[PDB]
Symmetry: D3
Subunit: 227 residues, 6 copies
Amino acid sequence: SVHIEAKQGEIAESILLPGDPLRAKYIAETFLEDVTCYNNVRGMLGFTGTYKGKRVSVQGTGMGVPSISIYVNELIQSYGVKNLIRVGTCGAIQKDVKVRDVIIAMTACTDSNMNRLTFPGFDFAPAANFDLLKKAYDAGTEKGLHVRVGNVLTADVFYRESMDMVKKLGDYGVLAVEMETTALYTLAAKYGVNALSVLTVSDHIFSEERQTTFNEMIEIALDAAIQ
Amino acid sequence: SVHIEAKQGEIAESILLPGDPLRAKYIAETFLEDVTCYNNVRGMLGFTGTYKGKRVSVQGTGMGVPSISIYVNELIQSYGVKNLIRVGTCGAIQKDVKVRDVIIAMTACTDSNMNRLTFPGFDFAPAANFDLLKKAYDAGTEKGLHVRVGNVLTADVFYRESMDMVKKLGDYGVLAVEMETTALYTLAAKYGVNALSVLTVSDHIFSEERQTTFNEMIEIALDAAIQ
Amino acid sequence: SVHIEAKQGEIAESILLPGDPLRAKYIAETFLEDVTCYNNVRGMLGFTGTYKGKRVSVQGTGMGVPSISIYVNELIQSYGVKNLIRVGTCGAIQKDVKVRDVIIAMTACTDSNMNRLTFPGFDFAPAANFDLLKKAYDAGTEKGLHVRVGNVLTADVFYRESMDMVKKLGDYGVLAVEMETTALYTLAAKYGVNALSVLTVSDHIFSEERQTTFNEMIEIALDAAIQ
Amino acid sequence: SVHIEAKQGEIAESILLPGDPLRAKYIAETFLEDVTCYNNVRGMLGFTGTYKGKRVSVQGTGMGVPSISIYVNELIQSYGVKNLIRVGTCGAIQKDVKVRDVIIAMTACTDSNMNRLTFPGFDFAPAANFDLLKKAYDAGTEKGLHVRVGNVLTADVFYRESMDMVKKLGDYGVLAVEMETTALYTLAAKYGVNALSVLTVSDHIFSEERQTTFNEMIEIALDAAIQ
Amino acid sequence: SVHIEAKQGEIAESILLPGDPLRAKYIAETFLEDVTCYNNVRGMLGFTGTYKGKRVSVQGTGMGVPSISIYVNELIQSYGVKNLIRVGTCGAIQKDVKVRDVIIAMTACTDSNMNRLTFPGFDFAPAANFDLLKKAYDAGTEKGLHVRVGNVLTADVFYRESMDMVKKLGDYGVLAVEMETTALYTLAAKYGVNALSVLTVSDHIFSEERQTTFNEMIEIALDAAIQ
Amino acid sequence: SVHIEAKQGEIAESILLPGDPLRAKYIAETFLEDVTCYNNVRGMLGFTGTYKGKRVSVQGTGMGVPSISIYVNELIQSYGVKNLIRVGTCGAIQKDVKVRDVIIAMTACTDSNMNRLTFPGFDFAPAANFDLLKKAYDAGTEKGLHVRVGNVLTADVFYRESMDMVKKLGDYGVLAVEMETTALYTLAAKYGVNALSVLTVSDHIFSEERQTTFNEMIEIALDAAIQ
């Protein structure tokens, strides 16, 4: 495809989607066997290998709705990908959310215009695939993680001049802020495929220090993927 | 309160919220014991009684975001209600959704302006309480119902001149259209209380004939409430 | 129709539209002769009878743009109704407006999205039928009422977190806030029929205690209707 | 003021506001006695004289919301003007509106952003002063004119690429299109003064040939002004 | 055309566009030879004459996007005009911009809705013709003027209740506020013709006293026009 | 900073900003001497070296407004960068724009919401620094390149369902589509620093095959930077 140099068939139907391509490399090296690298265009590493005997891929997305939209469109439309699980970081914005919590996004709020363009006059609420959500939730519960299922903010603007609205969203239960989920969930819904975002809380708005938790999160995402 | 003539303490902390006040009367008569009627202002019947020994209420909301917002604000702010479960009807707009399916709304899209006023520049995605959602889903699964967990449209406009956008939403996986969930979920989040919408599919866009399914739905909503 | 169980011909071409269905019952019992009740679906009482020898109806609408839109669409499109007069309550938001004043809405402002959907990029100003307006104004003047003809706000949100905008509207002469007029006036214009809203001021933002004034208002609305 | 070179006291408290400054000159020459010209800045002629013994002014406004807003702000804030009556032309957009009809605007729709800036999230419906409206309506009725009281569109865009929305507005009863009323009515409301627009229909979208009708219109506007 | 009484061929392909028609008269009298006046409709004077032997026109536009849009549409579509240079005034809103500076607008911000109607969901940035821009910049540099090339605000609202946003725009480098450029640049782009705005700073937000600078500006605009 | 692991002083005050970090590596290897790599966080390579004896940096930005905003905010606020020149690719959307043309963006249109959040009710037109623009234009003219100075679209959505609006923008002279310029220009203006985007046309909507042109573009960007 335009931004992925893989041949047809090189990318598995289930894929993990970190924002950081170097985390894709870490995931492939740490968890997968029989690994190949199918992409290095723009340094946006993608790998395919096996986990517990099942073929799976891991693909960096970059940061922000426009970047992840490119990769997700290409993966779905050009490579036949069916199960897409973002594995990322986020910043807590609700008072009771703690560093190293795992957040499974049911839905996402956004300051992006991407859905207002598509659905003028409407507020589109992008929704997780419930099947994947339940699988990841059950896996994380079994593994003994602090898992929080709820709402997140997908932000275009990492550095805001005013945080009043972000605080207000936290007052309405929005758990954390990240930069991808609205696009992943919307595009998966568009194409009738299955998406989920699983996030580790890395800081509070108002990699080795979370490597163990991060590993456990990757494990439940892979678990939900290989089912 | 302004629209509810109940004394303090007369309304239980868990409440079912049909749109039709006559369905509130039906629910009270059919399922509850030791029933009283605490409201008839505007004919918007509300009742309190016991179910499997636990005190619960049932309150009509009327149709539309503005009507349900009035009742939900008063219930939460004036009567200390903590668990609110809408039990309603909806019209299918996604091709695979069938009449008599039960839909548990994870989130809701809307053509209402109510959240754009509160969060200018943002798309707010109102989210169910996951705890209640899981309880209702597990109850409906155990009971052998066709339960679908996903996205719904909360519409201001029942009679639209153009259905192009509603069709487009169905193409993005939105299951059905109803007229309340955005407000219930948003207000519950605002006040830190717990909400869910459970809906029976009554027709396809493109009461006795569903009384058995409707009863089973009321049963899982009560089950999720009394836990 | 979907929400009205009347047979063809049971609803008169002129109709009064209180928000409260119990006020429809009061109006029918107090003012009309040879009364029948043609609807009790959702408790939304509707009646037909005679006033000064002329056949007229009275139909509850519920609260809010979405609720009244349902009823008005059905009345116009399924029952051939031609003259529709809302008879309601409102809250004063302009300093000189007093409790028990009668307000005849020339037009309405709104926080609803219903007209932005229909006319993207435009501000639609819903207008009363001038003929009905003049008839009601002349009747109220003759009857010796305090009648104020002007602008109102049709609100989706009865309980607002911030009242800054409502105050600002009052500073621009908007008289009072209610929850229906934008929809009534817009739909009547759409279908080429005649609408008016006549309102009693029940409180100031910043039923027996107004029963005499309320009666006098019902009288001028009926007068404007039977002409 | 910035755009009017008049001394304090030179402009009367009642003023007619044609868009065309040469029509201000025509009105002054044809109807007024003891006339002076108080402004020629930007050629935007303004005059003061007497009509039926009462002092009145006539001031060009130019075309469009931004131009008339300048003049109306200055007249109200710097010159103490209290009664402002636009006397203009318009193009019919509703099928039953005829050339040479006189339209008295109750309210105005707009494609301008001027009120969305002031009232974010709201649709502001600018309203005529009813007192002036009634006076002009009664005068025009007595004079035997075809007077139509209703809604108009205040357009920013005289030459539109697509007229679909203008046609749709006509289908919702909007009578004609002009380029000033939203601003006049909004600013008059802001400052607690009295405004009206009286318009002659000059063409149908889909000066000597209307000089007699135009004169009769000027006469009723002056009549409403001198009361 | 509707607002210009010129015959075909009477208006030159290059035209200067002051807002003030009396400045059009000044320009024609001061700079042009063999002058005729081709329009006085609405007092909006237009002239054609010769400058350094080349035929050129000068046409008032009035104030505001809607007024200039009318004239520019007619000039382009009915009179075949190809090079359009606004020569106007502006108010400084950025701290380093001085009275009598000449500002050449690269682009313009706006509070107008005119481009949101045409490009829903997009921010359209109207751009100068670079060829004309370079010619005017080089001419002004040669002439020894203080020329500033940058961003301006095209305002609908000359008298704003709050100047917070205007100050914020100045903090983002927007140089000055005026009332025409967005429309001129957008319409020229629509029709594939060439536009520029050259402005003299007349005051700071937070004719003889600038007649020399104003003349020098007219000179560089004519220079850019006759090339 | 959060996304750049450089020490204070390691990044030069003038920087080139390709979207592709591997193009940053190419630029450093091909054009710069005495090179170090100061960042590999997220694979987003950044380098500092010397060009014609002057210290300069080159930093990947990733794709899309949110990604480039992160890097530009950090470069300006944490590293004291003063001159920022994007060197990127774009797709032609105006009929006369050719592959391998160099486009220097005067301004940018966008489908992003980033400026509507900051300037509610306004269209913000992000503007290039004219000084840098002129330097790059003069350098490209001297070098004999096809340089086009004009408007571009900064898109969030690379894969659009409907291209109607993109075509319409091309009809209004918008030259090409890319995914960064609005953010670069807006943030540079916010902080009072200097930005420009220079783009090579890589395809038409409706790396070695452009390596020579791409090199020439890098050369003029470096030229404009080292002045």
